[PDB]
């Protein structure tokens, strides 16, 4: 078909290439290098080849795929590792037995050899089918019991043939639909353009919390499955616990992890830690890899792959959302993706808008984060999925002022402010309460009043007592320790107890690896009640020092409240917390005498 005309770095011009679309990917050269069209001049199309082009010869045929950058959606993309453009790095290594990635390799994104057990759905021959309609399910792995396969959203017609129950490979056709006479064959997989958001019937308001287990962010700065989150990706801030808690203990039915441009060492650490990370349901019996697919890109990869990493990840997340599975997408570093965009723009010579970034960076981020959210999936049956994004930001200079982090903070509703100092002092998960915030607190009021009505007032009471103690720390350093009133010292001690036994969570320990929402709420009640009882008793009673020294046993009890095993059962834990509160009330009543 086409032919190479001129090459200069990553950009290639192909002559007599009439009939190619805008962003249509093509197979460049005899090596069949993949490249994306970016400009058209009659028959001459400007191609942004991904890999190195030092070997291309003017005259090499270039074949147009006919489709834009599309990810292969279907069974077999779970538990797999991909690059930005969804190349099966595991299969890449196995088929070539080479240390490095072969240039121009074209291993299918989904394993074409695996035979998948397929049970057809309620749709039958002669029925009318539209995009997103489940016409069968495939048992992918032991954790994703039913991988609902979907008709592609842009396709519709009248079903004329369905493969019966059995085992099929992804190359086998299993569905024929008729639309305007022409037949269409549908296999177990379908490709979707990566940049167009995958459509839904209706996008709802995300109101169910994204329970991660980390008590500090599950209580103080909650997130909703379908919300957007921003965390600092700086070195040593302890974002590993956040990523592992979302991929290990969250409500998500699937996990999408994307490495945009992370360094090679860190990506290696991620790729070794994730396979040896096990789930929580049914008592830690399965690997989270069965629930997680990864997009991995080291420091030096095709820049287009780094730029398209997050788009591929969010497209996979949307594909699983359309099945009714609540997914959560974790971005290794949005700053690396912004750097990839900046280098792409520099290669294209576009006008630098802000600090060298393109003018559409804010729009791109806004659209990408709006791709997330709870939504009714397209087609029948009526199932609802959700995509939540936890994107990490890591400015080069750490000033937290470059436009990418400002746009992310403006768009994302919840920000979990991991801090260097807290991690230095061995305080984990090292979330800086003073700077962190969550705008989903108002939305979650419905869920709280339905489940834990007392939760919001307890949450903002803890917020204000920690803020008061934070400011009284400066007051103390200004004047002296003795200048505090009794109530001020009550606030100080309550805040210190909170920082030691509620915000701080060991994570590796069995008792606090996963703190459920009911246990979190019970600890909310315990700590807030302790503060309120101390405040009232001192206000209408004797000096604080005697009471606190005498009531140190109750303080130790509410400290050990962190040690209550959630595995004992929610009812048992709630009853034991009620016993603890009863003994607390009785013992404070005895002390105030």
């Amino acid at each position: 078909y086409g032919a190479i005309y001129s090459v200069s770095g990553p950009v290639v011009i192909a002559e007599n290439m009439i009939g190619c679309a805008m962003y249509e990917l093509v197979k460049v050269g005899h090596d069949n290098l993949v490249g994306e069209v970016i400009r058209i001049d009659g028959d001459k199309a400007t191609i942004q080849v991904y890999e190195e082009t030092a070997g291309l010869t003017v005259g090499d045929p270039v074949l147009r795929t006919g489709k834009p950058l599309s990810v292969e959606l279907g069974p077999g993309l779970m538990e797999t590792i991909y690059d930005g453009i969804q190349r099966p790095l595991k299969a890449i290594k196995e088929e070539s037995q080479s240390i490095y990635i072969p240039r121009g390799i074209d291993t299918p994104a989904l394993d074409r050899t695996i035979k998948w057990q397929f049970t057809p759905g309620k749709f039958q021959v002669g029925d009318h089918i539209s995009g997103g309609d489940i016409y069968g399910s495939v048992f992918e792995n032991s954790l994703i019991s039913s991988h609902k396969i979907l008709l592609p959203p842009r396709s519709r017609g009248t079903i004329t043939w369905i493969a019966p129950a059995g085992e099929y490979t992804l190359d086998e056709k299993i569905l024929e639909v008729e639309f305007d006479g022409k037949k269409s064959d549908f296999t177990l997989y379908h490709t979707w353009p990566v940049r167009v958001p995958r459509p839904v019937t209706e996008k709802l308001s995300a109101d169910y919390p994204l329970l991660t287990g980390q008590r500090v962010l599950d209580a103080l700065f909650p997130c909703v499955q379908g919300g957007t989150t921003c965390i600092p990706g700086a070195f040593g801030c302890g974002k590993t616990v956040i990523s592992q808690s979302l991929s290990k203990y969250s409500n998500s039915d699937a996990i999408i992890y994307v490495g945009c441009g992370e360094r090679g060492n860190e990506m290696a650490e991620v790729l070794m830690e994730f396979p040896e990370l096990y789930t929580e349901m049914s008592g830690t019996k399965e690997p989270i890899m069965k629930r997680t697919t990864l997009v991995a890109n080291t420091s030096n990869m095709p820049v287009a792959a780094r730029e398209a990493s997050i788009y591929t990840g969010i497209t996979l997340a949307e594909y699983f959302r359309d099945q009714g599975k609540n997914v959560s997408m974790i971005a290794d570093s949005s700053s690396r993706w912004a750097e990839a965009l900046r280098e792409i723009s520099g290669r294209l010579g576009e006008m630098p808008a802000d600090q060298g970034f393109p003018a559409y960076l804010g729009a791109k981020l806004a659209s990408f984060y709006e791709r997330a959210g709870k939504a009714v999936a397209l087609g029948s049956p009526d199932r609802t999925g959700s995509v939540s994004i936890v994107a990490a930001v890591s400015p080069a200079g750490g000033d937290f002022s470059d436009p990418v982090t400002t746009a992310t903070l403006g768009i994302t509703q919840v920000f979990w402010g991991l801090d260097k100092k807290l991690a230095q002092r061995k305080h984990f998960p090292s979330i800086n309460t003073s700077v962190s915030y969550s705008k989903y607190t108002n939305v979650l009021n419905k869920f709280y009043d339905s489940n834990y009505p007392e939760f919001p007032v307890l949450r903002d009471r803890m917020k204000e007592i920690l803020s008061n103690a934070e400011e009284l720390e400066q007051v103390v350093q200004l004047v002296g320790k003795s200048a505090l009133s009794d109530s001020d010292k009550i606030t100080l001690d309550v805040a210190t107890l909170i920082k030691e036994d509620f915000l701080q969570q060991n994570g590796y320990s069995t008792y606090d690896a996963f703190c459920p929402i009911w246990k979190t709420f019970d600890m909310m009640r315990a700590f807030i009640s302790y503060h309120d009882e101390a405040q009232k008793a001192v206000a209408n009673g004797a000096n604080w020092s005697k009471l606190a020294d005498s009531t140190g046993d109750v303080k130790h009890a509410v400290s050990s409240s962190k040690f209550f095993e959630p595995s004992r059962g929610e009812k048992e834990v709630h009853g034991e917390f009620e016993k603890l509160l009863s003994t607390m009330q009785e013992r404070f009543a005895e002390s105030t005498d």
Partner: protein, 475 residues
């Protein structure tokens, strides 16, 4: 079997007396057949002088050659240029150790051309993300300023930040002459099959300094383990760009094919960045921040990531790029990108150099991002990390107490500050201060750090665990 029989195939390399014109360090050829991106040429001046060059741009019958060492005297009627097969490739072999090379790979000692085992592409290849492992050992540099503190892991990319007039070259030479594995010391001289090699690259290096490097490494046992590269300032600058590529190609070959532990040292990355600026401006390219090309991040990433331990192969690459701060500022693009790519850094301080202390490593602003893996029980010695932390804390306390000396007076300081001033004096005079030809093994460095840290009573050593104090304080 070795499938190298393709080397016997002979290809027609063409000669073109068709130079249309000369423009700066570039010559342009009109009629060159079947263009592909990059090649290597050997053009001859009308007076018979053979000159080498590279290929820059490619379009329909478009070829532009960037001649090494300029284009003086090149005419359009007599000069002829010979197009070699493909791009630059270094003749690499196991016996390359002990050889000194020019920036073009041609040996400059009295030995012959290296008897090649294979011609390796200079650019390299992208390592699969599915086949990487963490650096999990220690490289002993013999410098106590870099061993006890700022320890370098076996695979860590850690730079050395210095200024124009400071003796970074001397520290590089000392590291290269003294570098080695801690294991032979730890394994009681039983481990010898874990061979260790060094690849030293000198870029923009001054003629006297290059002579110093050559003479010093020749006059010591370092050369037998060292494959050495030089590039003079008056030498062609694209040779300066080639030099780190050659050095890392040799190091990668040795470590990941001969299963050697290779320490790579790159000298004066600032000169390499200047060469980048010159070559980027050679073509009609818009300059970037501070004049440097906009893709310098990617190039430094390519150079630096050719390091570390890999899955399967038993070798390792430890990289110590050395660069000069143009204006003693972190914000300059070269140190900024080097810190953004590498792991930690080592600071050579101007004031510490003026105060007559060598080697002048400034401990406070220098950290090793992977020091934890280099520290252990079987790895180095058990007390290593705690001693390093205690030394850092005591040095910082001594430093700010010395700063306060002129504000509150000596008598207003606590016993903490008195012992800290004494510790700082003895520290910067005996521990950091190390002879240029003095090789402290890591255990000797730890023993000196203990004898110097024994100033304080065990109560005052907060940064060290009591389990270590009950073991090492009393000797």
């Amino acid at each position: 079997k070795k499938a190298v029989e393709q080397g016997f195939n002979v290809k027609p390399r063409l000669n073109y007396n068709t130079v249309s014109g000369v423009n700066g360090p570039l010559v342009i050829l009109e009629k060159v057949k079947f263009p592909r991106y990059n090649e290597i040429v050997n053009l001859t001046l009308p007076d018979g002088t053979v000159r080498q060059g590279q290929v820059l741009e490619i379009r329909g019958d478009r070829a532009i050659v960037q001649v090494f060492e300029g284009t003086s005297g090149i005419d359009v009627k007599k000069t002829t240029v010979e197009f070699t097969g493909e791009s630059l490739r270094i003749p690499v072999s196991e016996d390359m150790l002990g050889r000194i090379f020019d920036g073009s790979g041609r040996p400059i000692d009295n030995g012959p051309k290296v008897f090649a085992e294979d011609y390796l592409d200079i650019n390299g290849s992208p390592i699969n993300p599915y086949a990487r492992i963490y650096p999990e050992e220690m490289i002993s540099t013999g410098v106590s300023a870099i061993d006890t503190m700022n320890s370098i892991a076996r695979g860590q990319k850690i730079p050395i930040f210095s200024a124009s007039g400071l003796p970074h070259n001397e520290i590089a030479a000392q590291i290269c002459r003294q570098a080695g594995l801690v294991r032979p010391t730890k394994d009681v001289h039983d481990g010898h099959e874990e061979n260790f090699s060094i690849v030293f690259a000198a870029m923009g290096v001054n003629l006297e300094t290059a002579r110093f490097f050559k003479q010093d490494f020749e006059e010591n046992g370092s050369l037998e383990r060292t494959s050495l590269f030089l590039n003079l300032a008056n030498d062609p600058t694209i040779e300066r760009i080639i030099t780190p590529r050659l050095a890392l190609t040799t190091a990668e070959y040795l470590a990941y094919q001969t299963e050697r532990h290779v320490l790579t040292i790159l000298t004066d990355m600032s000169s390499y960045a200047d060469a980048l600026r010159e070559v980027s401006a050679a073509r009609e390219e818009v300059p970037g921040r501070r004049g440097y090309p906009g893709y310098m991040y990617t190039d430094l990433s390519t150079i630096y990531e050719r390091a570390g331990r890999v899955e399967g192969r038993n070798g390792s690459i430890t990289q110590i790029p050395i660069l000069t701060m143009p204006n003693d500022d972190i914000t300059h693009p070269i140190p900024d990108l080097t810190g953004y790519i590498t792991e930690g850094q080592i600071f050579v301080d101007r004031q510490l150099h003026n105060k007559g202390i060598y080697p002048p490593i400034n401990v406070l602003p220098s950290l090793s991002r992977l020091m934890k893996s280099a520290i252990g029980e079987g790895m180095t010695r058990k007390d290593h990390g705690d001693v390093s932390n205690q030394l850092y804390a005591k040095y910082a306390i001594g430093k700010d107490a010395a700063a306060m000396k002129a504000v509150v007076g000596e008598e207003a300081l606590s016993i903490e500050d008195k012992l800290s001033l004494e510790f700082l004096e003895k520290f910067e005079k005996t521990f950091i201060t190390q002879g240029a030809y003095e090789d402290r093994t890591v255990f000797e460095s730890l023993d000196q750090a203990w004898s110097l840290l024994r100033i304080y009573p065990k109560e005052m050593l907060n940064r060290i665990s009591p389990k270590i104090l009950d073991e090492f304080y009393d000797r």
